[PDB]
Amino acid sequence: MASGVAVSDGVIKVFNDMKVRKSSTPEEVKKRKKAVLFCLSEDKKNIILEEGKEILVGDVGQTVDDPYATFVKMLPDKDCRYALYDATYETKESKKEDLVFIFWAPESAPLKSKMIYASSKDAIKKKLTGIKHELQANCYEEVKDRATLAEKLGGSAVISLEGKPL
Amino acid sequence: MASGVAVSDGVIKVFNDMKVRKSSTPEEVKKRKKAVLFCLSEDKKNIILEEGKEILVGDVGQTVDDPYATFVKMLPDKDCRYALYDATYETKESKKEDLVFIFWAPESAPLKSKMIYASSKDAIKKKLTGIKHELQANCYEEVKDRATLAEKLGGSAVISLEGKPL
Numbered sequence: 547m548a549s550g551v552a553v554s555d556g557v558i559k560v561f562n563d564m565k566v567r568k569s570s571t572p573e574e575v576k577k578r579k580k581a582v583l584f585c586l587s588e589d590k591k592n593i594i595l596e597e598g599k600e601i602l603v604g605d606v607g608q609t610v611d612d613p614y615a616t617f618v619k620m621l622p623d624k625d626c627r628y629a630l631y632d633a634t635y636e637t638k639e640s641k642k643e644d645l646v647f648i649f650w651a652p653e654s655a656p657l658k659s660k661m662i663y664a665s666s667k668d669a670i671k672k673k674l675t676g677i678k679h680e681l682q683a684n685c686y687e688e689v690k691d692r693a694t695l696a697e698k699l700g701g702s703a704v705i706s707l708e709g710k711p712l
Numbered sequence: 713m714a715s716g717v718a719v720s721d722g723v724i725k726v727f728n729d730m731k732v733r734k735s736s737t738p739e740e741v742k743k744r745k746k747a748v749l750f751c752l753s754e755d756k757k758n759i760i761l762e763e764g765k766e767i768l769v770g771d772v773g774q775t776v777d778d779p780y781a782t783f784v785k786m787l788p789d790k791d792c793r794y795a796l797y798d799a800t801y802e803t804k805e806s807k808k809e810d811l812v813f814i815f816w817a818p819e820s821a822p823l824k825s826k827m828i829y830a831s832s833k834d835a836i837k838k839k840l841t842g843i844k845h846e847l848q849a850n851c852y853e854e855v856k857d858r859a860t861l862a863e864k865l866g867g868s869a870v871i872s873l874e875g876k877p878l
């Protein structure tokens with residue numbers, strides 16, 4: 547693999563902040579990140595935050611309406627990305643929320659690029675202590691489908707995602 | 713990369729036979745291969761012919777009717793494959809035929825499996841002297857489309873594939 551890649555402290559903090567329980571006020575929550583993208587640096591030595599490429603919880607009621615679809619559209623067509631998506635979903639028992647780590651390697655991306663991203667994946671995944679869920683996607687028409695993520699979280703038990711029907 | 717993988721003489725012969733000009737009779741032609749699959753061995757040390765997984769030219773008039781669609785369906789859903797497909801297609805100038813090398817790495821395949829196939833790709837590609845065209849595919853709903861291949865062969869100039877409209 548490639549374990550000569552570094553993860554910024556700022557990236558790490560972003561992860562940690564996302565798995566926070568609503569002990570804090572109603573303002574930093576809403577400033578909370580619903581989704582976020584990371585990418586490799588030009589030199590392929592760092593995993594860094596892609597600014598602007600994110601969805602804050604505050605945007606959900608107003609700007610966004612569907613957080614999952616908005617997130618899917620953020621996914622570039624020729625470049626690989628890592629992502630964290632904070633999912634909200636329902637079974638027949640409970641309404642739960644879980645952090646999903648996403649590896650995006652779109653078909654049209656250079657094969658060299660996919661290889662490097664995949665080989666370096668462990669460098670960020672290892673630092674994402676207690677992550678649980680991982681989604682690997684190549685095909686846009688497949689991630690686009692809510693059932694894709696839903697099935698990954700809890701399979702057939704999952705009946706809705708982000709308040710929407712599957 | 714991985715250059716510790718061997719290509720069988722039988723595989724090599726199959727390639728060479730496919731780029732043959734119709735100097736021979738009308739019987740070995742029709743016994744000619746329209747498409748063929750290769751895969752890595754269990755030990756990942758050989759690139760070998762996957763028997764049964766092929767389309768002979770003779771099947772086209774009768775058993776098959778659409779060679780491209782039939783070929784696409786042969787593509788496994790969880791496993792990577794290499795393939796050669798002998799394409800017949802038309803521009804506004806000429807009706808041509810060309811050999812296309814295909815790398816199939818389906819989304820649902822184990823990431824470990826994709827990596828090994830991709831890293832070993834050069835071992836067979838190098839032995840496919842004067843190949844010209846390569847197609848890499850992850851997403852089934854995309855290879856399925858004739859325009860995918862057509863665009864790869866000659867882009868927008870190509871107006872039909874295997875006698876069919878795009």
